Amino acid sequence: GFLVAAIQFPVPIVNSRKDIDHNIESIIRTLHATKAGYPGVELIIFPEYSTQGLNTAKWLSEEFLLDVPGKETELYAKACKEAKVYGVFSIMERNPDSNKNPYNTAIIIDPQGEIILKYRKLFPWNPIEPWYPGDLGMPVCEGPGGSKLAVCISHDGMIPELAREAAYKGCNVYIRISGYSQVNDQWILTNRSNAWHNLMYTVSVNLAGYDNVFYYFGEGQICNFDGTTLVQGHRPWEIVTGEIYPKMADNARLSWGLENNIYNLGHRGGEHDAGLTYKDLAAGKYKLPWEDHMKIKDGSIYGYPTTGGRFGK
Amino acid sequence: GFLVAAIQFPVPIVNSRKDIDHNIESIIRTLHATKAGYPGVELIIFPEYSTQGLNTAKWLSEEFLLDVPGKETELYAKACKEAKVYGVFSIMERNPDSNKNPYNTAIIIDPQGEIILKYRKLFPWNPIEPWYPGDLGMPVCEGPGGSKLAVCISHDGMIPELAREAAYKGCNVYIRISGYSTQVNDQWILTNRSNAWHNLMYTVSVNLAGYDNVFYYFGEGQICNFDGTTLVQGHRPWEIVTGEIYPKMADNARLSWGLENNIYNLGHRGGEHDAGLTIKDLAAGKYKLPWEDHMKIKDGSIYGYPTTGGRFGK
Amino acid sequence: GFLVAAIQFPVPIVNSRKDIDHNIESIIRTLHATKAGYPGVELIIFPEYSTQGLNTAKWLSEEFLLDVPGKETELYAKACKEAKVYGVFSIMERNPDSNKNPYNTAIIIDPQGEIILKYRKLFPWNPIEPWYPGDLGMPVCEGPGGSKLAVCISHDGMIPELAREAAYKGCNVYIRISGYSTQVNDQWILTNRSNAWHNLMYTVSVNLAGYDNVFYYFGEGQICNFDGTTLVQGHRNPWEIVTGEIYPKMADNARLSWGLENNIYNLGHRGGEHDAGLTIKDLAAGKYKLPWEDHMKIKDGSIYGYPTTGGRFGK
Amino acid sequence: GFLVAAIQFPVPIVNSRKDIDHNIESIIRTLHATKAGYPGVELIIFPEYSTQGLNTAKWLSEEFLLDVPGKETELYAKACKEAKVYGVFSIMERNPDSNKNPYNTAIIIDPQGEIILKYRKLFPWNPIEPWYPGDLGMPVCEGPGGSKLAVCISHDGMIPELAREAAYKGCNVYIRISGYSQVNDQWILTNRSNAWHNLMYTVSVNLAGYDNVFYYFGEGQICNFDGTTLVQGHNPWEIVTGEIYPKMADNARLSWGLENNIYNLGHRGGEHDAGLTYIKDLAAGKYKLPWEDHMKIKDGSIYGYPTTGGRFGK
Amino acid sequence: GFLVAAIQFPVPIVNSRKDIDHNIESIIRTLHATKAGYPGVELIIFPEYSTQGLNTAKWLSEEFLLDVPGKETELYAKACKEAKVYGVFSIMERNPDSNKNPYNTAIIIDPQGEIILKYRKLFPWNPIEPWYPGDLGMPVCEGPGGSKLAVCISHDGMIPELAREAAYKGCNVYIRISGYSTQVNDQWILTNRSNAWHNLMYTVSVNLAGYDNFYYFGEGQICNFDGTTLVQGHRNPWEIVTGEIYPKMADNARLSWGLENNIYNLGHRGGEHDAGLTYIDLAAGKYKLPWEDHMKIKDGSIYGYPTTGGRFGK
Amino acid sequence: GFLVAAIQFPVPIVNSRKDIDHNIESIIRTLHATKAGYPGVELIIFPEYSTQGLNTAKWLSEEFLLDVPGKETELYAKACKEAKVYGVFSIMERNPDSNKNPYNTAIIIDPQGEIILKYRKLFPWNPIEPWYPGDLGMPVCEGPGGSKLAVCISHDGMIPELAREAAYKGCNVYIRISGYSQVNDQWILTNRSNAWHNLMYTVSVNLAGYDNVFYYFGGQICNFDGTTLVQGHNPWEIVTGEIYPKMADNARLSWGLENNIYNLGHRGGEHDAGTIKDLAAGKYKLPWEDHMKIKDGSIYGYPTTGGRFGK
């Protein structure tokens, strides 16, 4: 298998582009330091917002936005190539369509300096997050030591359907960059269930904040394919490492019978209809019975406009 | 709200209809005694296989099968009306289609001795369970103290999409009657908690106890808050798990929460309604995993079950 | 110090005096077997209702009641003398005043065969328990290994003022015999710890097992340090023994030496303001009264079918 | 109910009055930031010593002392008014009587800038604390979402009698602001026991540590009325948040029979004398432990304090 | 790897040989039933004293002693061959030297029905156990799924030097069959975890649950090679702890690891080969604690045993 | 008994002798301040590398090494005498043999300023640590409140034989100063087992930080039966508790069924344990040594021939 490393990267305050650049260099220095301290490490992970922070007053402005790929991702690509590692990074990506809000984007770069995975946050943390829903789906790429990497972003991990989708497309190591975190206990909970439901590893790491900007939030969790937590970090700069053996997870999906739950879902050769009776979500008409009387269905509580479009530029 | 009671019933060792009748009367006596011990109790839950046991050599035979409803469920209904409680029971149900295998069925009976919910196990615990996949979907019913009750069966609770479905239909107290375990033990506690948190509903779950000729111990009755917090936990046989459930707070959270209102976020990424979902594999009945060709267990032959389907084990 | 044993005793169903006699001999059998297994043990503890069970339809009748002292307590005394141990026993005691309901009584017998502590449950578990509120206060007696023993009964241990009371009179080893539960499981572990830490004393606590005609799975069994740290934890099975060594002198030293965390002293010496403020001493004057008493749903035993006019009933 | 917030404020090192004003502005800037991050929060709580720190060499000097009310409490009140929240603050209060040491004082301010609760620490953390014993008893006030708030200060929370007193006067949400903590495990323990003993919620938060470098000294906790821990802080600006439902603690006190312990204490309609028929000492002011004669610490001379009383450390 | 099962077997009182023979059939009935319940199981593990119990008044008598191998071990071997599993059994063994006390013995049998490992308890649980110190050392044998099996007996597991020894001979799966406890309960879980981590091997442990006529002493445990508990008996008689063991992962770590390869570090601190401890004395048979003169228990007189050695209790 | 204090000391970054001097004064100020806040404390413990840090580029250099004893140890000694406490300190010690690498040394200083214990780490954390294997064995001294103190250093604590060795020589309070920590869980695990195996207390504390900003690297007091009594959760976090070594002494004298340390040599029992033997003769050899990937320090860029390097 392989050795993974997740950094409970702290996020200081961000007030300008030079602070974003300062973060970028800091992330790169960390990546080289981590490789020097753990020579065997092949995958190094940074949390969501590590590049840009969470300045809600400026985080939609063009100054605070980057392109993917771009000169900043190329610096990360440069860093991965000479350190000879896979790296996971966070970019608040400028939308190619200027009338839409920016995306919340995660990328995985290989030891050759190539972006091999690009994911845009499918489930933004509403109502606080103004990011446009991702349009690239849940992609999977080839990782080190026989791993099939997929990455989700913070809130995404609370949606078991998304963990199912990654594993459906072949993922055996599910990465979750963050983060939150009023949700601390449920973050531990979902990292374990995401693992167990789909017979895959989960490697997760949260940022470290309060305002949310005091250097203490992220946990850093490694879960076995059976849901058992192998490594647990506390609440900045805390590094969570551990050996991952994706093959044991792959074998479990092949040999297991009784609790092969991911297979059971489609083969109750079993009944191919799960009920799904007379599948709303698939047709885009997912509707809860209590939607009419809900209090929060827009971002007005956080000061955002309700008509949508581009804002905060 | 209301007070619930989950009984970690000892798995019976069953060799005939006579033993099945002994179990029913034992369940009935336990129900009346739980009411006597807890006068404010409104929901008494029994686990999967508490009526018929797990005699794998015999459990497909007609002698070991009951109709739902039938003479046996009416005896449960009488007890419920006499005790004035909601009751959750388990019956291995004779398939009205004599060319198909029996269902694994759960029923909820109200304080007036009427069946208000009937659920057929959607996900049998393959490959050990030869039950036919349920055809009734996931139903929801009115319960005590403003609750909307739904019930799943052991293995069913390992499927997050099913807990989503119950909630999608208005369920705020998710019931899991179970006949595991000692190999899925830690994950049984995990899923009971995740099923709650994912959908902002209470989960009330209980497993049986003695599944051999004896071995009277599995249990682990569990009550979880809508935020995934475990309120009450059993260890162990005849262990009773009681707690007060306040379903109104779960309903209010669904209405008032924003940041962690995940059950809403799923359909409103008014958000992008398509979750990608880039069509509908499961919905179109073509759910297929890339590693399916090399899987070892895709039938029941490992437990000696025929692989051509139809009715077997009479 | 000394070695302690707490038995998560299973009480079968009691339907007659014969069954009570069977329980007595079984408890005696258990005491001698525990001494043989643990030759160093000096304190053996049996839970509430271990003698007479919890037949709520017959437990108020004369057949189900004993005298303290009586012919049965002297069987316990004989066993304790033969084995040379301190023993803790439970007896539902017939009230000498025949116009009143019976007490829920606990006793401690010394290795000399004498009753050295007699306690009547001060706080019955209302509304399910019909026992008369005990009139003997909270007594403290001398024990083995420098220990000063006091015993409370199940529901008693949920009252922090009672744990205070025992310690206030010298107790360093707070014993809790119990017949719960499965609705107070977590809170039983909680209060066994808090009762210890509040007063800088050890707590040794044990609960029963069964009632429903074949069952027996209720108890826990717990030994806590004087700072509230749990040392030994029994599970929930019948016959489960909880053993551990107790060093009572260390608890006493903590009460003498400690300054910052000496909370039992701080209560009366805020040489400090002697008035705790405490600015209506209601409980002391017997006029303790909660603001929501008018609107309470359960203030008698009618929910369980008990007469609401007091006196003697259930004979 | 209502959404509460507890901030594990970092202990400031204080050397002058400027540093105190620096803290006040920091607390005010933290309060407005919490409201912005959680638009639904109605109660933001700060720990003991958040305003003035723990400079034991200077914490008795008039420079380090404020009045309640004063211009500093009016700054907190102005902040509460502008943010529209209830706020809990700490003030080392100058004693209006000149022959007595300063008080350790907590105040609750409502969304209109009114101080609706003033409490002086009844049990100072002796022998390290020189504060005069409080004289205002244990007050209770109305809060948001139908709550009845009461506050104790750090050491006060180790005294169950005080938790009992708060509840006795109607409190359903017991607040504990703190500047501990060599008592870490017993902090979590007593936070749960205070809740359960009295059938009320507890919300507790501790300051974060002294010495110009150390800034991380304790936890932060929310407990349900049954003692169950709901949220747990687990270092400086950690924010502990959770939704509180006080009416269902009220309901428990009205509904419960078996474990309605707070009622059982007075009605063992029960015997009114707790018996307590031969240890009724604290009422008359005659509390006396049998071992008081041999105690090693009964004054503050271990930390350099004088032993004859009066005003000192000026 | 392979699937392992550990049964928290109960043993009732034993009063005669007819009870011992009843135990053997029960163990054999359980073995076939476990294989039927778990078709993939390759290792079935029974606890210490599961064959003969702990009648301390008769366990030294000829009536209570068996030969290893012998007619009774043949019954175990036949059962293993029929079920096609490895089996681990417990036998109190008549000493081939009739002038010395019996041994406390454990055996492993392969699916072909052959004894491939025999071990005699090196550290009897003094002073309560009268068994003779084992003379066969700590053996290792080949098991299923690339495992190198070794077995220790209850009290043997509290001695870290023995766990080191097994691994030193190749063991990657350290089995602990046990007949404690409830006075060493917490430390049993501890040592199983440390025994694994110290030597980078799996530990599979199980205790008897019954020896009195309290059938609840067991606590089956599977630990990962880094100390992590994977499955925990939790607990009761007839409770079966199951889990998949992947021995090659432990072997790889011993080959690949650098920073925590402690088993290698011990002898190569190419390192200083002399550890510089020399209590390692023990090698020369001079192990001597500085406080032996003042110890209370150095014989079995407290349990009534004579202090002259030789054969007794016959 | 006595009161103990363990400081989860943060180590900032060390780039010069000046920084080391700053570390020394910080420790001294912390020692006096802990005495002030806890006037009843008699043992204050500082973690491994608190004096010199972990600059792996320079930590073998002559600038970064001190002599034991030296004027830096006499600064600590002066502080212990003025505060009247026992102190435990870390020193990376220049090897008197200039052809060999420096030791990783721990010292205990009493209230008289006397170093009563000097321990050179027997088990350097290979392959990352280049320190020379200690030659002073596992020493034991007389501590406060009836204690017999021994000190092991970080990685030493994963070796139960060493914990056995300390106890064998009388130790009833086993101190572990540490600069880990990827092994956070196993650290808590071994602190408990070291205690239970030998019927002695264990007081342990790990360092905190080095990454130019990072400080939060993993403080534990365990009872003689292995039960954790106090557990730290910060850089600068102080772990305190009262230790009663007499109760540990008594258990060793009193216990029968539970006396494992005695049983090891008295299976009067069989004195042969039943071949540790290879280790005594210096021939400890694992069957899988030939296929191991890490038997030197080339993974971290160290030379593989021994001698003096990094100076």
CSV table of N, CA, C and O in Angstrom, one decimal, chain B residues 158-180:
chain,number,residue,atom,x,y,z
B,158,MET,N,-28.3,-0.9,7.3
B,158,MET,CA,-26.9,-0.7,6.8
B,158,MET,C,-26.9,0.0,5.5
B,158,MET,O,-25.9,0.4,4.9
B,159,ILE,N,-28.2,0.3,5.0
B,159,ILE,CA,-28.4,1.0,3.7
B,159,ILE,C,-28.9,2.4,3.9
B,159,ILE,O,-30.1,2.6,4.2
B,160,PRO,N,-28.0,3.4,3.9
B,160,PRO,CA,-28.3,4.8,4.1
B,160,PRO,C,-29.4,5.3,3.2
B,160,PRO,O,-30.2,6.1,3.7
B,161,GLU,N,-29.5,4.9,2.0
B,161,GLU,CA,-30.5,5.3,1.1
B,161,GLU,C,-31.9,4.9,1.6
B,161,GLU,O,-32.9,5.6,1.2
B,162,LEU,N,-32.0,3.9,2.4
B,162,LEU,CA,-33.3,3.4,2.9
B,162,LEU,C,-33.8,4.3,4.0
B,162,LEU,O,-34.9,4.6,4.2
B,163,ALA,N,-32.8,4.7,4.9
B,163,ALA,CA,-33.1,5.7,6.0
B,163,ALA,C,-33.4,7.0,5.4
B,163,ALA,O,-34.2,7.8,6.0
B,164,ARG,N,-32.9,7.4,4.2
B,164,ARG,CA,-33.2,8.6,3.5
B,164,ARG,C,-34.7,8.5,3.1
B,164,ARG,O,-35.4,9.5,3.2
B,165,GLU,N,-35.1,7.3,2.5
B,165,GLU,CA,-36.4,7.1,2.0
B,165,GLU,C,-37.5,7.2,3.1
B,165,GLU,O,-38.5,7.9,2.9
B,166,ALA,N,-37.3,6.6,4.2
B,166,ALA,CA,-38.2,6.7,5.3
B,166,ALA,C,-38.4,8.2,5.7
B,166,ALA,O,-39.6,8.6,5.9
B,167,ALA,N,-37.3,8.9,5.9
B,167,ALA,CA,-37.4,10.3,6.2
B,167,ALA,C,-38.0,11.1,5.1
B,167,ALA,O,-38.8,12.0,5.4
B,168,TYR,N,-37.7,10.8,3.9
B,168,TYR,CA,-38.3,11.4,2.7
B,168,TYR,C,-39.8,11.3,2.7
B,168,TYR,O,-40.5,12.2,2.1
B,169,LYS,N,-40.3,10.3,3.4
B,169,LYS,CA,-41.8,10.1,3.6
B,169,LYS,C,-42.3,10.7,4.9
B,169,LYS,O,-43.5,10.5,5.2
B,170,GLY,N,-41.5,11.3,5.7
B,170,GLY,CA,-42.0,12.0,6.9
B,170,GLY,C,-41.6,11.4,8.2
B,170,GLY,O,-42.1,11.8,9.3
B,171,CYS,N,-40.9,10.3,8.2
B,171,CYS,CA,-40.5,9.6,9.4
B,171,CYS,C,-39.6,10.4,10.3
B,171,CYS,O,-38.6,11.0,9.8
B,172,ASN,N,-39.9,10.5,11.6
B,172,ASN,CA,-39.1,11.2,12.6
B,172,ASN,C,-38.7,10.3,13.7
B,172,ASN,O,-37.9,10.7,14.6
B,173,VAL,N,-39.2,9.0,13.7
B,173,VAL,CA,-38.7,8.0,14.6
B,173,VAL,C,-38.5,6.7,13.8
B,173,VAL,O,-39.5,6.0,13.5
B,174,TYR,N,-37.2,6.4,13.5
B,174,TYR,CA,-36.9,5.3,12.7
B,174,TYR,C,-36.6,4.1,13.5
B,174,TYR,O,-35.7,4.1,14.4
B,175,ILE,N,-37.4,3.0,13.3
B,175,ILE,CA,-37.3,1.8,14.1
B,175,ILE,C,-36.5,0.7,13.4
B,175,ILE,O,-36.8,0.4,12.2
B,176,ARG,N,-35.6,0.1,14.1
B,176,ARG,CA,-34.8,-1.0,13.5
B,176,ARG,C,-34.9,-2.2,14.4
B,176,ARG,O,-34.3,-2.3,15.5
B,177,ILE,N,-35.7,-3.2,13.9
B,177,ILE,CA,-35.8,-4.5,14.7
B,177,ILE,C,-34.9,-5.4,14.0
B,177,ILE,O,-34.9,-5.6,12.8
B,178,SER,N,-34.1,-6.1,14.8
B,178,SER,CA,-32.9,-6.8,14.3
B,178,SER,C,-32.6,-8.2,14.9
B,178,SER,O,-32.9,-8.4,16.0
B,179,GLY,N,-32.0,-9.0,14.0
B,179,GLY,CA,-31.6,-10.4,14.4
B,179,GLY,C,-30.2,-10.7,14.0
B,179,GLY,O,-29.9,-11.8,13.4
B,180,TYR,N,-29.2,-9.8,14.2
B,180,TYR,CA,-27.8,-10.0,13.9
B,180,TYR,C,-27.2,-10.9,15.1
B,180,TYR,O,-28.0,-11.8,15.6
